[PDB]
Amino acid sequence: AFAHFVLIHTICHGAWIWHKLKPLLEALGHKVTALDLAASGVDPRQIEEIGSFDEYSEPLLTFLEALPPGEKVILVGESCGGLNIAIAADKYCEKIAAAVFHNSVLPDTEHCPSYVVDKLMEVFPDWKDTTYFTYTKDGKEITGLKLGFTLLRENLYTLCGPEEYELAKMLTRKGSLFQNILAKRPFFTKEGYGSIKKIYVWTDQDEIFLPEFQLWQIENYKPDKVYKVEGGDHKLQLTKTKEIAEILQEVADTYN
Template identity: 45%
Template sequence: MAALPLKEQTHFVLVHGACHGAWSWYKLKLRLESAGQRVTALDLAASGIKTKAIEDVGSFHEYTEPLLELLVKLPPDQKVVIVGHSLGGLNLALAMEKYPEKVVAGVFLTAFMPDITHKPSYVVEQYSARTPASEWLDTQFAPFGSVNAPLTSMFFGHKFLSSKLYQLCPIEDLELAKALIRPSSLFIEDLSKAKNFSKQGFESVPRVYVVCDEDLAIPGEFQRWMIENGGVKDVMEIEGADHMPMLSKPNELCDCLLHIASKYT
């Protein structure tokens, strides 16, 4: 797809998914910057090169703090396009809820996308209910937190990475992931107690969903269910993309984001 000409530079903020970090955007960051855009790929708490461990993160809000802090520090006249991948869609939603005036558009890249009718945990709970335990393969889960605030950590296994997430990626990117992924959490227990997102906050920001049709982790059928459930009208699709389109289809994803920026900025 051909992107419309951008009148001015767009600031893209890239939010990774569970167990990943800013490193997962390395191909896309280069391409967007080469197209003249400003890009911030950040590590959420206990991710990437952050020193904190997931066991030291007490809530989803705390996990999201690096993104929220970035938005707070933006100059008053500056807005961003936030791209949330996979679990990062929920971090994106929290940021849109708290600082809607800072976000031009929220892009859900084969990501969990909540609604305003149910608890923030709803889509992840639905996903878990529809995903047999056997589908997680060698992914490891373990309890952490306190009696009053229990959480469950999650660490993708090598079989899960290769067959569910990276099956269409270059083998080098799979090896990079094996070396760099870290334990994370879906934060279902915490999100189930959180307030619903609102029409005035989260839903007031334009939302775009990007479908990846070869995704075996969050299948296309579930992606489209979330689109319908969330009432999103602006939907784009990257053909031949697995769960990691920033690595398997970086050129197509770059074109997609430039098109979105040209439409909303």
């Protein structure tokens, strides 16, 4: 079967992270959309204009709004993109055939939206040469970050080629986790986000979303299906592109 996949990058990244996976999925016959979220990739906004994870998600919500009735998509979110998935599913659940989590945060419905971010920060407290700043938007102080190049090399792009790490140095931008805004946000809903099918894809060789964190997330909120990819690194769409496409094909053949 063919599907329409919507690929969702993590904070400080853009659609460009999907530059290897997108053509491979198209070579299987799928439709693929790879979005830039707000203040990401070549989006014209700067992060200081963005006040919440929901606002950050606007391009995804706008895209889903534009789908004609009856058309469903498979969302694929890497790393922090699982939060964009949850936000989207609480507006457009009927348009989502499934969500695939790709070394991603896996929010739940029982705890506040910041819960898995809070846990991540406990498991991985030291972001190396990442720099931080603060800005104010809608009366709240937001912590911005710019991912450190040592962190990128060693922990995110561990096994990627030098020309892929170079792209990350060139293209990663200032972003935010909006952790304190998530902490005050209404909970993700059971009828919306809780109802979607959730497929959790990961590698234990991930050097930022460590196994203790990922296995904790799987226990916390049981996925419908788990795929473990052997080897690779956090950026499986770069280091295990073929394996990710094969998994996504099977998801397209299972959920519609």
